[PDB]
Amino acid sequence: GVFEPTIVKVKSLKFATEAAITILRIDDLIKLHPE
């Protein structure tokens, strides 16, 4: 009797992949000093 809605696992796949892409494409950080 262990069940879960299918929209939970479908959405979590799409959100976890798009967030990994945007972090992966970064090859430089410039941090500006506060004023």
Partner 1 sequence: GKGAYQDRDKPAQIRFSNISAAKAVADAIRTSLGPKGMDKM
Partner 2 sequence: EGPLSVFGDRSTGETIRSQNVMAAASIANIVKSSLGPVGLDKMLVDDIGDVTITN
Ligand X SMILES: Nc1ncnc2c1ncn2[C@@H]1O[C@H](COP(=O)(O)OP(=O)(O)O)[C@@H](O)[C@H]1O
Chain positions contacting ligand X, by CB under 6 A: 2, 4
Residues of 6-22 as b/e, b for ≥16 C-beta within 10 angstroms?
A: eeeeeeeeeeeeeeeee
16 binds, among partner 2, ligand X, partner 1, none (CB under 5 to 8 A by kind): none
CB of 26 to partner 1, least distance (A): 5
DSSP state of 35: -
**∠ CA 18-21-23 to the nearest 5 degrees?**
115
Site string for partner 2, 9-28 (x = CB under 8 A): --------------x--xxx
Binding site for partner 2 (CB under 8 A): 23, 26-33
